[PDB]
Design a protein around this ligand. Structure first.
Ligand SMILES: O=C(O)C(=O)NCc1ccc(F)cc1F
Length: 181
């Protein structure tokens, strides 16, 4: 999938081939789904104002490359938490979590007042990958349309390994007849 990954890179970059970082801490990328950074995840007052009911930490961990939070952190607010201990590297198999994350997003949106924040450290690689996978798996969007819609609403940049994982997901869903044209 080296070309399909390059094709996805061309959709992320500007036309000069360069990659921009997020211009804001948090964005609603599709209705009731937000992608953001560590600071928004750790600002409970901000979360309550946005009306976030569910937080999916896609970078849970203890290092400087992780966000060191847990369900306890959110007990007082009544926010429902899910953590995934992922690393932002080309070899980390985030695809093993796609079903779990999609189920959690579905759980959040199944309540009419539900709003989910999917976040990582910068809201740039780990978290957008999960949202894109969700859109493909649960809203029948092909990878190009899903990545494009997220990228229109937030500067994102999944690493090439994550992008290769999304391409393999796309091939499987296509063949199973689960993608809209
Ligand atoms: O998966 C993530 O958390 C993620 O967003 N990684 C990108 C990133 C992390 C740290 C940094 F200083 C600059 C970055 F662009």
């Amino acid at each position: 999938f080296e070309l399909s990954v390059q094709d996805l890179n061309d959709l992320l970059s500007d036309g000069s081939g360069c990659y921009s970082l997020p211009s804001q801490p948090c964005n609603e990328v599709t209705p009731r789904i937000y992608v953001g950074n560590a600071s928004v995840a750790q600002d409970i007052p901000k979360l309550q104002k946005l009306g976030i009911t569910h937080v999916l930490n896609a970078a849970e961990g203890r290092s400087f490359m992780h966000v060191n939070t847990n369900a306890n952190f959110y007990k007082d607010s009544g926010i429902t938490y899910l953590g995934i201990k992922a690393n932002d590297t080309q070899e980390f198999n985030l695809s093993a979590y796609f079903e779990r994350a999609a189920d959690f997003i579905d759980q959040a949106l199944a309540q009419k007042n539900g709003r989910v924040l999917v976040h990582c450290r910068e809201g740039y690689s780990r978290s957008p990958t999960l949202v894109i996978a969700y859109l493909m798996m649960r809203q029948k969007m092909d990878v190009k349309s899903a990545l494009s819609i997220v990228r229109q609403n937030r500067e994102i940049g999944p690493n090439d390994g994550f992008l290769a994982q999304l391409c393999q997901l796309n091939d499987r869903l296509a063949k199973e007849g689960k993608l809209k044209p």
